């Protein structure tokens, strides 16, 4: 009292609106710029969320910043996948209630390849019939799934918090009223979905960096994302970012 899962439910960020103006036809530039502004605001909410996670603030501040800096795209894409799963059963990308991207609007320059990759995340929720509590536990593990190759400043704390939420995901599984063999296979399928996020998010990040560095595209980024992207960029090309996999 209170259960950990009940706390994750109450700290989940509320969905934000985009204010997108659909009066006139869409353009790839106006759409990407609107999404980045929305993305910057969702990341601010994600920081508020992470600070309320039990155990997170026991980490060194530099580690709190590293984890959020390394995993923000995977958090946003995983939440987009969930919203799209509940709204359209994975048929459309529900970036926001006032900005839904169906198969038509994806037929824009720079949009199609990345939007298809994000539809694939939503379709995994459909195939596996993920529950809300399973989703909340998996989303915490994403925050704890990408670390520096040289380790964190408080590795001991990090290792224990990560196991705390691995166990919590198990509790969410057991709630489905399955036997031991079923619960282990369920856990296997969900830890495989988490591992696949690293590759599916890789292409999203590679393209985010592309639109950020090439100013010719006229794509606008909020200061929140600009600061994170520019600081995150030299670490990736240097190969100092290692994902944490359940399966090798």
């Amino acid at each position: 009292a209170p259960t950990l899962i009940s706390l994750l439910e109450v700290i989940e960020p509320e969905v934000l609106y985009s204010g997108y103006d659909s009066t006139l036809p869409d353009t790839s530039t106006r759409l990407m710029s609107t999404l980045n502004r929305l993305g910057g605001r969702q990341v601010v909410s994600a920081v508020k969320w992470a600070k309320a996670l039990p155990g997170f603030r026991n980490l060194h501040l530099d580690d709190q910043m590293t984890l959020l800096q390394y995993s923000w795209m995977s958090l946003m894409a995983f939440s987009l996948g969930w919203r799209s799963y509940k709204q359209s059963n994975g048929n459309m990308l529900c970036f926001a209630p006032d900005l839904v991207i169906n198969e038509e609007r994806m037929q824009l320059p720079y949009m199609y390849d990345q939007c298809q990759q994000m539809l694939k995340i939503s379709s995994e929720f459909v195939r596996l019939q993920v529950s809300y509590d399973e989703y909340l536990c998996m989303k915490v593990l994403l925050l704890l799934s990408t670390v520096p190759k040289d380790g964190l400043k408080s590795q001991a704390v990090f290792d224990e918090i990560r196991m705390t939420y691995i166990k919590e995901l198990g509790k969410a599984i057991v709630k489905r009223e399955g036997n031991s063999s079923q619960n282990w296979q369920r856990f296997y399928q969900l830890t495989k979905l988490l591992d696949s996020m690293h590759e599916m998010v890789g292409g999203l990040l590679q393209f985010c960096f592309y639109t950020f560095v090439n100013k010719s595209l006229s794509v606008e980024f909020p200061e929140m994302l600009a600061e994170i992207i520019s600081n995150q960029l030299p670490k990736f090309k240097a190969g100092s970012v290692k994902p944490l996999l359940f399966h090798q």
């Binding site: 601010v44 920081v47 508020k48 600070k51 501040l61 709190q64 910043m65 959020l68 800096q69 200061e223 929140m224 600061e227 994170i228 600081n231």
Partner: peptide, 11 residues
């Protein structure tokens, strides 16, 4: 370090 992110985490 990204200033806005750090400002959020240190309150």
């Amino acid at each position: 370090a990204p200033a806005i992110l750090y400002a959020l985490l240190s309150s």
